[PDB]
């Protein structure tokens, strides 16, 4: 697979390849998203979920949320990609988490990035100051927090105020990934992904992991593409049989715009190449990634 990468890098064709993907990508209708009663539920007016793969709230009032189920049949994993919640969609976001039985949330943006507000503060930052979402009958409490240098893992308790059932949700927050940019290194990315993997949040007995950033297509797309490719490599039991480009086009049947720059696509290759070492049998490269990540202090 490194052959294909070494060539593109010498030829400098990354932007041409990325443009090729945009041209070939699926184009399905988004009628529910464009209804006028849903205008205030969309963060960006050029980013919408397809009708056929959108998540529906179990709600009679309005079942709409800007979120898409990305079901990778062959890799046998599902992801929910969504926009960073808005002040009025925090209750819907956690309604979705609950109804879809998600166990993990991956957040790849910061609440404020280069000036502009990218996301609402949708989870509690202090144990003693829990959030109640009255519109959706949910209560959310911070339980503990594991702060590392470039990411933080929080343990949250989601309580359904109707039934008093409670569930534990793991929140993985990547703090050093700029909008329209890439991670510092494949090591810090893969260390983050394997932390998510190790938690069990991606296990198929749970509902789909929820992944978001600002729009839920760029950094969110990079994260899900790398994970699925490494899944395919392991399942087929053949590294260089995985075509990153075809996998990304498959994902874009479920949500528009996944992977937002040509450099994010280059990084995706770089990350799958580096991750192949673990899949091939070098299980100890994982501890290497942890060291190159500088996750302590």
């Amino acid at each position: 697979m490194e052959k294909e990468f070494e060539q593109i890098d010498k030829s400098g064709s990354w932007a041409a390849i990325y443009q090729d993907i945009r041209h070939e990508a699926s184009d399905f209708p988004c009628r529910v998203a464009k209804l006028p009663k849903n205008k205030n539920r969309n963060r960006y007016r050029d980013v919408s979920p397809f009708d056929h793969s959108r998540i529906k709230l179990h709600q009679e009032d309005n079942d709409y949320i800007n979120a898409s189920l990305i079901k990778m049949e062959e890799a046998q994993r599902s992801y929910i990609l969504t926009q960073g919640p808005l002040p009025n969609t925090c209750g819907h976001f956690w309604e979705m988490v609950w109804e879809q039985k998600s166990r993990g949330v991956v957040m790849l943006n910061r609440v404020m990035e280069k000036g502009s507000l990218k996301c609402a503060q949708y989870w509690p930052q202090k144990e003693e100051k829990e959030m109640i979402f009255e519109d959706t009958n949910l209560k959310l409490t911070l339980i503990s927090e594991d702060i590392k240098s470039y990411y933080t893992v929080r343990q949250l308790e989601l309580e359904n105020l109707t039934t008093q059932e409670t569930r534990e949700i793991l929140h993985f927050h990547y703090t050093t990934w700029p909008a329209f940019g890439v991670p510092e290194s494949p090591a810090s990315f893969l260390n983050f992904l394997f932390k998510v993997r190790e938690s069990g949040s991606l296990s198929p007995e749970h509902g789909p992991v929820v992944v978001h950033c600002s729009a839920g297509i760029g950094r969110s797309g990079t994260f899900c593409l790398a994970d699925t490719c490494l899944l395919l490599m392991d399942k087929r039991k053949d590294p260089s049989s995985v075509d990153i480009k075809k996998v990304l086009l498959e994902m874009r049947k479920f949500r528009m715009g996944l992977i937002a720059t040509a450099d994010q696509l280059r990084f995706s290759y770089l990350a799958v190449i580096e991750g192949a070492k673990f899949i091939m049998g070098d299980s100890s490269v994982q501890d290497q990634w942890k060291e190159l990540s500088h996750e302590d202090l």
Binding site: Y44, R45, D46, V47, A215, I217, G257, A260
Partner: peptide, 5 residues
């Protein structure tokens, strides 16, 4: 408010 800004 457009993603392609």
């Amino acid at each position: 408010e457009y993603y392609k800004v």
